[PDB]
Amino acid sequence: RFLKVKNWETDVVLTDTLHLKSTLETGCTEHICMGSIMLPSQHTRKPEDVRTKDQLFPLAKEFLDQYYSSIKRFGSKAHMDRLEEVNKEIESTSTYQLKDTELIYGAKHAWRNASRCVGRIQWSKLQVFDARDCTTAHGMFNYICNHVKYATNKGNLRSAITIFPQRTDGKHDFRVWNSQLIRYAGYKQPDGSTLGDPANVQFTEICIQQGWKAPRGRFDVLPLLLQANGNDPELFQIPPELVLEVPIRHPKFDWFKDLGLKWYGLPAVSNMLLEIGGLEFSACPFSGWYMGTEIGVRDYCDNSRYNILEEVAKKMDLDMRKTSSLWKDQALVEINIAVLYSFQSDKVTIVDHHSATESFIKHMENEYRCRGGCPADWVWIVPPMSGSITPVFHQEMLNYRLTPSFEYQPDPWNTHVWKG
Amino acid sequence: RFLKVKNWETDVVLTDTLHLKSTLETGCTEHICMGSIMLPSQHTRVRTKDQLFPLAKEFLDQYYSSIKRFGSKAHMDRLEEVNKEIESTSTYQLKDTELIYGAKHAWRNASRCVGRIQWSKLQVFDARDCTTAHGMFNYICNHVKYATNKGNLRSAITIFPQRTDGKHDFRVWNSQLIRYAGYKQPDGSTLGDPANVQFTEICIQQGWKAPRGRFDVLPLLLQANGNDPELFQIPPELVLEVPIRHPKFDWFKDLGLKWYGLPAVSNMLLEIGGLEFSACPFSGWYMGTEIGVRDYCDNSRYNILEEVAKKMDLDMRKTSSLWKDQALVEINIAVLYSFQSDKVTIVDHHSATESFIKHMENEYRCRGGCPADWVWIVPPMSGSITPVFHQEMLNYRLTPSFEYQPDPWNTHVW
Ligand code: HEM
Ligand code: HEM
Ligand SMILES: Cc1cc(N)nc(CCc2cc(F)cc(CC[C@@H]3CCCN3)c2)c1
Ligand SMILES: Cc1cc(N)nc(CCc2cc(F)cc(CC[C@@H]3CCCN3)c2)c1
Ligand SMILES: C[C@H](O)[C@H](O)[C@H]1CNc2nc(N)[nH]c(=O)c2N1
Ligand SMILES: C[C@H](O)[C@H](O)[C@H]1CNc2nc(N)[nH]c(=O)c2N1
């Protein structure tokens, strides 16, 4: 079966056959589309769902078939020997270890398969750091520091992922309790207002309970809370000289610097789960570089985040009485101009949403031609401002789940059995 | 099976049971989501005697429930009467009350429509007695004048006779009652609206005398009883237009932009209780972004971004100056400002999406849900600063419904 997608701006039609290799489920049915559900059950991974031999060798075999195909060795003796070796290791030890080459392939293809990621043109240039020999939270801290230094590269950002030991019985998990490696604290005040990043209040409170001495400012970089081998997590402070930040100023508005805004340069997601051949890597922080709107639209202008639209619109002296003045849209553009101006001026890698979406369309067409498709989630790919003046708005997309993959997992403070 | 949707800005959670009453199909499966396909086969559209009575029964069931007469004598009598009429005539006719209910509920069920908070105030014009294209023209002029109301726009639909054997179809060939012509210039580009180049051709290539201008109101091409379609010019005094100026940039007027007040979709199919109304033009009032973002700034449409930005003297060397985004906001300020100045009804995308969230809350509370298509509900600019961006939505197909149908010129047995 073949499936066509049309770009309604250019009339380019592409044909998807890759969806036939889709294994996991979407959450939709013929009678209901769940395409706007944020974290459906099919995109998450409960740690209690630890796999049996029963289901593991078919997942391994399918991964290894894909791997050996990509290296033009399908059906070779190396291929058959590896299948044999993995089979014996499973029935004997109930799990198996990936080779270094397989791990690198797996992590690159999990990103390649991430249908919500607009930055996938870069997928083949991922630096994979093998941390599967790590045993303690202190060792995790050291690996994460090296990831941050490497990825940051003094502003010339480089994509990277660090992969800690895989899940065994779900009782000895490695977890990074931070949602991102670098994030600002948030503090609920007694008067109900929030200081700092409202999205991080709950995690900030955990850190404080675990002994963090909170500066209680608006942009305090959170400590790392790291869990090795299923033990209680431990606190660590990232060396501040490793945390690259950018003060936000506007190229025309001199008062903008006086808002006191900054952001960090390195977006590094650390709470997702990497699935490769049925193995589950519960700690696998990865990082790239920012698209401007992630900071300028969502981080700064979501009502439930720093929420700076009013103050910016006040200082611009826009007509704030009626929404039809579009004072919110005007301030939004100026804030996003400032984010991009500030990063470029400091020579920190950033991409604007016009550039990123145009590159994604080129990536997607290439993937149709060389791979037979490119799974893509329109709801997430379209940028959160100026949607229809980017080319992805007009692009039909097919969403399906391929493995290897990144999955969501429950926050560990909800599942952890505390040792004390 | 009893599903929940969450708003991530407010944490409000709603429970949906209405989807269990879904009848048509989405195009998705458990292995693939087609949520961003413009026109799956299901959203496009002869009925045999067999499929028609269950459809009629389902519709009459929900109608008599809505008036609290489910299981009443009147209900059962109507069921058998339509049953008798289908067995006999191979179709049936709706009572006026059922027609009005069916139309309002087709709008209520339109999961892609952000304006549905207004669904119950729709003015239904019964045109089922119409027999000719001149009669269709008369009915449409009356609709346009009633709906326009000197700029105090009112929602309305006009329903022409239902499909019979599929050979006597009533169709409005225009996609909207009021749209601007488009012509392929000899110099290579496109004058007017590029979206309407084909239809503009079929007007000339059927008789129209085009002014070959940039904002020429297209004539109506009306098809009655399956005959050949006929041209009619809508009286200009009935077509309310708005010159587009900016409340700060005096040069804006020199761009020469205008738009019409009345958005009136004319090419969809209305399905009520199995019956098919192939000609059912309906109208409401614009959300500003429809004109300013899509009509004016789409690259396949009037595509004015570059010209506006040049007149603003923005740095167009690099995309990262966000000159497109700046111009886009100013264009959309001008649209709202112009309509508001001329006292023509318009809603901005902030007000409309806030209204839709309130509508969703009402529908979940009083109906058990509200089918909604996030890809279409979220506005084409400033998506995440509108509340619908953060609102999870369940998309499913309820009937009565509006459906797409093939363009007539591809189907007409000429
Ligand atoms: C290199 C530049 C990159 C850019 C510009 C980029 C951009 C984005 C953006 C804007 C999103 C939407 C998420 C949101 O709005 O919060 C996203 C999602 C995602 N990105 Fe990328 N990304 C990049 C690199 C990477 C890398 C290196 C990885 C992994 C190796 C990755 C994996 C993902 C995944 C898994 C998601 C999906 C999250 C979900 O399913 O909810 N990205 N990306
Ligand atoms: C009164 C104010 C109204 C507003 C502000 C409004 C707004 C919108 C918008 C912005 C869209 C998106 C489609 C596009 O971008 O081209 C839409 C779709 C739609 N509207 Fe409404 N509308 C209104 C009235 C009505 C009425 C009176 C009807 C029918 C009686 C209706 C039926 C529909 C349908 C069926 C669609 C979806 C077409 C599809 O499935 O692709 N609307 N509306
Ligand atoms: C690697 C990377 C690059 C880049 N430009 N941006 C990112 C962050 C995007 C991202 C990537 C990702 F994989 C997961 C998330 C979490 C999204 C949450 C879910 C609810 C609220 N938001 C976010 C990562
Ligand atoms: C009644 C009405 C009100 C309003 N504010 N806007 C409209 C027009 C919106 C609309 C409503 C509708 F039902 C159909 C269409 C045509 C869809 C095409 C196909 C892809 C691009 N557009 C458009 C109608
Ligand atoms: C409900 C809705 O799915 C949710 O708000 C989504 C919409 N699209 C998104 N797209 C991106 N890139 N990031 C997001 O967090 C979201 N949130
Ligand atoms: C391919 C994609 O579905 C297409 O561009 C859609 C996206 N969302 C839309 N949303 C609305 N309201 N109107 C549209 O025409 C579209 N076009």
Ligand SMILES: [Zn+2]
């Ligand atoms: Zn779907």
